[model samples]
Target chain A: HQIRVGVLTVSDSCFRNLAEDRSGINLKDLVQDPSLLGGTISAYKIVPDEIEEIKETLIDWCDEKELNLILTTGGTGFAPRDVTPEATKEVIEREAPGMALAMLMGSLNVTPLGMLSRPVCGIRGKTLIINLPGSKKGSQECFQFILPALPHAIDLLRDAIVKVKEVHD
Target chain B: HQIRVGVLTVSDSCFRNLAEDRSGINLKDLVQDPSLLGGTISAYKIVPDEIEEIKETLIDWCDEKELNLILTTGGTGFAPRDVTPEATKEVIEREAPGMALAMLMGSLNVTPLGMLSRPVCGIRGKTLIINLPGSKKGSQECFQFILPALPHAIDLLRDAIVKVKEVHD
Candidate 1:
């Protein structure tokens, strides 16, 4: 049972090997379903704040079927280089709101700064992409908030079925 | 500063990335700014379990001019690729929630597998977009949870501002 998950950190500083982004590192720690997600990280890379590069990477990931779950950190802020969300929107066919809010609401409880986060989530085909804030604590908090549903979600993705009982009168 | 925000998310696999996605995450995180959104996140995103995508992303986000108040999240369950509700069908010149409730109220929660999550919300151009899920937590909460006041919401987006006073005076 192997679930392929990818972690892509977007930040000029991180990409340039200047600042240490614990947010992306925290994501690696939180998604700890070794049996389901796998023992070793599949795809891990850090890119600069470039939309075109991000787009090309996403397209390649989906087309190559490299990862099923893609978690992004950084490039989600107000900075001019923060184009992760934009890159995601251009490639996605549909959008999801419930899960995103849960994360936002969960974080809002932690900090008003959470109110400043614009994390986006959507589908590009069979691949799913989500953005997280740059702060390490925020990333951990978001991962914990969404932890309740991750296992079941991975199960569904792996094609496992939960039978629903039916009643006949 | 003025900012444009679009929110979209409404898929189980989306949050998990068993499905292809990148909408809500991108829009929410990309539009963060003081000038653009008064240092607050402008839009919201959620998981689409049973709703529409186009309505949440396009219709709702395209309703007004400046900053758009948008929310999107859906798949409308049952079979997981349902697209009954769209940007146009869910959002009209005016928002209608009666049908949205009918679907939400009728669906069985905490146990059942199938349900209708018709995407619901308003829209404007380059300003705001709201996307939510079929789940009460996803759609309803995403709409009401983050948005505290419609007036503040309107003001944040530069729609219109009114100062109450004594008319006769």
Candidate 2:
């Protein structure tokens, strides 16, 4: 089965068309990279850093019940308008911590300043919502670092669950 | 150096000073338990489910460098006012997925509905924000799972280069 995902880039400038979101485009590229853990980006959007708009878009996607994952870039930093993570938390039924840990650790390998990022990860119904840092390089590094685990994350959320049999060996 | 920690509780009815946070009291008990992980609660706050308030408080704690870790209780579930994950994401610099996964996986073992939580983990400057479920038992379980990794997380955030001499036979 194919995993349906949405790439949302939350930047006022991007939403206003003042700046082209190379990062959003990169997310599209990463998701479709034939070498990917293997999935496709069905749809994507560039929106202002407004919590209500982001929340509405997320709810619509969830209502569609098609997307298994959503990758959001921008508005995940210290800026006054950053609110994507907050919107995600308001909607998700449960929070997912492991994905965030993996990203922070991975980014810290490249820069100590990674300590200032407030990216978030959680699940709304079956969909996974992730907040990636705003800069192009930061988002790129984040996407690359999580690539190894994306397959496993998608599998758990999208596929049917089977009991793990106890080992007898 | 001592790992200063802060505990915050979010609830609509409680934060207005309309009602007492009984769960906050329980969370306080668990946080002070030296057996869970050795750390001191330097400060604690109670706030409504407003994004701005939560964001301000988290940033204040991080800016002061008063805490190495911040544990947020409540507002991590599906209720309309729940927005803790979002607030943490807005202020944190990076996401911590390993911690989140462990907490949820451990909690799920005790209940089938464990997958419904969308709690998040991330770093803000030198501090880390971990969102736990609203219920007392769920919070305890999540805390227990993450407690073991606290020391290492603190070490990494406080310094750029963490060197360890591992001995092997």
Candidate 3:
């Protein structure tokens, strides 16, 4: 199935065009790759670390655009401007912590710095929203870590429309 | 490291002394086992399937007693009395879906009935609260599924007071 996805880049420098949004672009490419899940990028946005911007973009992608998945790259650190999790918390109805933990569990194998990431995952309506780390490598690695479960999880979230149990063994 | 844990059984039959509290006892045994991450059962209670009672007990155990972990069995099903997750939702600051998903994923291997369980896992201050099925076998298996991660999770919650990392290899 071809899923609709949104790639949001949350970085001050990237938003200001000071640096390239490689992480967000990498995620979009991965999502669109046929070898993976073969999803289409329904929406894409680059915003600063502002909480209001993050929340508005997430709400728009999840509710207005009605995307199946929304992945945000950046603003998931200990810094004061890191408000992705906070903005996510404000928009989500149910938390999908397994995704975040899976990312952390996989990333920690690569670097202890993984513990410092404060990414959040959750559901808004039928959309699955996940926060990826800011760096190109970190975001890609974390995205790959959670890729296996996305199709099944998104199916479950959209069960109200298409109630199929094909993914489960 | 030594941890203080709470074993709460939420069942009207058990609370009224009609049915034995085997699930709670099973969790207590698992928590106190020296072979595992040895933890003391600081508080144990068998309350009715009432949400308010369960919420009050959980709050007292988490805040007043300051327990490290709370393993609640019963009232996590489809029945009208199954309000454990609702009570849990009202009290917890953050939901830990990985623990609940871990239990569901592991238990599904044993029985498809595992999916019927509406268990919830979350945090209250320094305490980690997880809901297990009412049956002895179900609760025991679910506890074993999340046992390896419990100690590490609890340690992370208490990292502010004592920042020691020993669980990860």
Candidate 4:
């Protein structure tokens, strides 16, 4: 009944068995930390940086697994194949830019190159999806940046039923 | 060549003649100021908070007018009718989130509720478009927040010829 979370690692190198999935593993650990969100890792997977593959996993997690929060690491950069943000935008029913702004501002404070990171945050059904950087340090820093508002955001989504009902009248 | 700029005011009240288009006028004036962007106002208009109307103007400016930059004020809030970001998203060919992050971070520093702003910044063809809040003060603040990057952004767009040419190499 606690916050159910999913961590998706989108990287061609990791999927091709070249590099280790260090960033994804780190993200999973971060969510389970008692001092942090302490979220249950409902689902985890490693996929290439293809937009179609990313979209399928995101949709499956939100629709079938019904996770409360989704953190996607990798492919949120300026690289030609980087398309996590694009895939996220396509699946999200509503856009929530503030969290992305928070992560970006935090990253920029640490490094000016943060501007090159294009992360997207939004909601689909009752799920909140966010894009984190591919690097382990970047992923962890972005997670902590939005940690303060995470609980409240998920709590509000729990009331999506009531909000949708009130939309008509 | 100087940056060709267009200012769009998206407000129901202003469109219906129930309120003054103060935000739009201020944005137009701000772009022309030498201390700021020092851009030429290529076109200006006031439209309601409707997506179609806003999109029509944006497409016309980017495709026909071929403006270097477009600043849209209003309809960027959580209000039910606020559709500037939505419209901008549909029109842009490439997303440019850094400028939006810069404005949001600046706004949040001024007021915590600045998170309510859902501005979108992107590029279509050679044109760059940004969504600012409806209030005159908010519009000015956001414009200034992104001012430092404006010249460089427009300059890059000006090099659309070189950028596209290099894509094939």
- Report the C-alpha lDDT of model 3 over B49-158, residue by residue, as the tens digit: 89999999998887677788899999999998899989999897565655666777677878898788898887766778899899998888888877877766777666
Candidate lDDT scores, in order, read: 0.55, 0.76, 0.81, 0.87
DockQ for each numbered candidate? 0.05, 0.07, 0.05, 0.15
Residue B62 of model 1: what lDDT? 53
Supply the DockQ value of model 2: 0.07
Give one digit per residue, the lDDT tens place, for model 4 in B31-54: 999988888999999899889999
Q: How many residue pairs clash in each candidate?
A: 84, 29, 0, 0
| Descending-lDDT candidate ranking | 4, 3, 2, 1
Candidate 4: CAPRI quality band: incorrect
Q: Over the stretch B88-147, how does candidate 2's per-residue lDDT look in tens digits?
A: 878876889888878866755555355456688988667888998877777877888988
Rank candidates by TM-score, best first: 3, 4, 1, 2
Which of 1 and 3 is the better model by DockQ? 1
> What is the two-chain DockQ of model 4?
0.15
Each prediction's TM-score against the native? 0.54, 0.51, 0.64, 0.59
In candidate 3, how many Å is residue B96 off?
Answer: 1.3
Worst 10 residues of 2 chain B by lDDT: B160-169
Please report how far candidate 4 places residue A72 from its true position, in Å.
Answer: 12
Instruction: Name the DockQ score for candidate 3.
Output: 0.05
Model 1: chain A TM-score against the true structure: 0.83
Return the TM-score for candidate 2, rounded to 2 decimals: 0.51
- The regions of model 3 sitting more than 4 angstroms off are A1-70, A73-86, A92-128, A133-142, A145-169, B160-169
lDDT tens digits, residues A1-169, model 2? 6878898889999888899899989888888777874568777888899999999888777656448778899987777999988988887655665566667766777888888788787766557788898778888888876676566566666642111211222
Please, what are the lDDT tens digits per residue for candidate 1 over residues A1-169? 6657778898889989998878877788766555333434678789999999998887776546535667788788777788998998887655544346557766777778777788887655445677777778776777665555444444444431111211221
Q: Candidate 3 A-chain TM?
A: 0.92
